[PDB]
Amino acid sequence: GSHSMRYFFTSVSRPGRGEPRFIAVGYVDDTQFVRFDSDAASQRMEPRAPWIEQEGPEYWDGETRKVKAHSQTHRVDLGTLRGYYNQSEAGSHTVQRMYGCDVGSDWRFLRGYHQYAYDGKDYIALKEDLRSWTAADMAAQTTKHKWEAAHVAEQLRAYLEGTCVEWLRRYLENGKETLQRTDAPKTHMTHHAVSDHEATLRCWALSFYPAEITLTWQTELVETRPAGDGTFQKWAAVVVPSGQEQRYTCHVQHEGLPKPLTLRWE
Amino acid sequence: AGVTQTPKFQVLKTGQSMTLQCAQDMNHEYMAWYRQDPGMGLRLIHYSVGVGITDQGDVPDGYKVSRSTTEDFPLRLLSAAPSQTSVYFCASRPGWMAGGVELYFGPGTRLTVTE
Amino acid sequence: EVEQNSGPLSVPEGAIASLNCTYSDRGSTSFFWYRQYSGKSPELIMSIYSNGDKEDGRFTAQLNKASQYVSLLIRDSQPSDSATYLCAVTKYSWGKLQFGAGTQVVVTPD
C-alpha cells in the first residue's frame, strides 16, 4: 500500500512571443491536487482537489511564492541551455523537472526522485542515494560541477526525505476518503466474430482505482486510461478459433479485489 | 580578496554625517548591511539583490544605501545619533538562483557617536 | 526569533564543546553556525538541512525540526577555538537570515 507525491514542471520557450510558458502540476498517486499556469489570470497555486482546499492562506502564499521561484529559474534555464548546446534564438525549446517521494504501506520513507530534461532527453538526475548526480552529455557536466559546489544534492535530499514525506502523510490523512480507497474493477466480456473460423474475445475492466491493474488471457493490450471521473479503464483481447471460446479465461488482478477474478465467455 | 570596508574605526559627534564604504570584487549580486550591538546579535539594516535595487531591513531608519555598480554598496548615515553607536558589517554572496548561501563578511566598522 | 545562551562556556582543551540553539519558525529550512573571533568578522563553518547529524572536520551539527533546536559540537577543542558562535536560521533560499546573539566559548590551555 505504497503512496507517492510527485511534482511536474514544464517550461516551453516562445521565440519572439514574450515570456516562456510555465506549467506546474502536483499529484498524490494518480490524483492531481494542485496546479499553476503562467498564462492563467489568478497567477497563484490553484487547488484541483477538494481536500487541499481546507488549507489556509499561508499555505497558498507559500506555494505561490515557491512556484514563482521555480518558474524564474526555469526561465533563465532556457537561455542558459540554449547557450550550452549552441542553438539559435529562432526555435522553441522545452525544459522539464520532476521530483517527489514515495512512502511504504507504513508511511515510512521509501525512495526519492529528482530529474531534469532538456527537449525531452535526460539532462541531469539525482541518483538513488540522493547524494550524487547523473549527467548525460558534455553540456550537463557544467551544471553538475555547479550544483555539486552549491551543495544542491544535500538540499534536495533534506526536502525529499523530510518535508516531502511529512506533507505526503498530511495529504493522505486529510483526503483519506479520496486517496485511501479501493474501487474494485467492474468487469464484463465482449464477443465478436472476425471471420468464419475465428472470433475476438475482449475482457473489460472499468471504474477502478488506483490505476495499477493486471489483465491476463489464458493478446491485444491497450494502455490504462482515465475515465474522467477519477477512475480508470483497461481491456485485453485475444483472437480465438470459433467454437473453442470456452477454452479461454480472462484473469483480473487489482488491489480492490479480495481475491482475483476469473472470467470466461458466458 | 573578499569584502573590504572603510573606515574600520570612526568617532562621530551628534548630528554629523558619514558614508561607510563597502566593496567586493567577486561579482556578487547580493550585498547587505548589518549592525552588531552588545548582546543582540546581527540586525539587517538594508540589502540589495542587484544593481539599482535595494530594500529596507529590520532597522533602516537613519540610514540610506545605493547600488550603482556590482562592486560597491555604500551606507550613508544622515545625522549621527548615540543610538547608532555600533559595529557595522558589510556582507555579500551570489544570488540564490546561482547557489548563493554563505554570507561573506567584511572586516567591520566600529562606530562611536559621542554626545 | 533565534535563541542562544550567551555563556561564556568554559571548556578544557581536547574536550568536546557543546553549543545549541532554538528557533521559533517551524517552517525553517536552512540552519547555520557562524564563528566570530573577538574583534573580527563572522565566518561560516557549518550548514545543515536534514534532521539528525552532519559531520565536517572537528565540527558536528545536529538538527531536530520537531523540537526546533540545532546544536554544534566541537571535537578536540583548542584555545584557537575560543570565539563567539552565532546560530543562523532562514526559510527557503531567498529567505532573510535570522541571527542569534551567539554563545561565547573559552577554551583553556591544558
Binding site: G26, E63, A69, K146, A153 | - | -
Partner: peptide
C-alpha cells in the same frame, strides 16, 4: 508542498 531549497538554475 513544493521544495523551498535545492531548486537552482542549471
Amino acid at each position: 508542498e513544493l521544495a523551498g531549497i535545492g531548486i537552482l538554475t542549471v
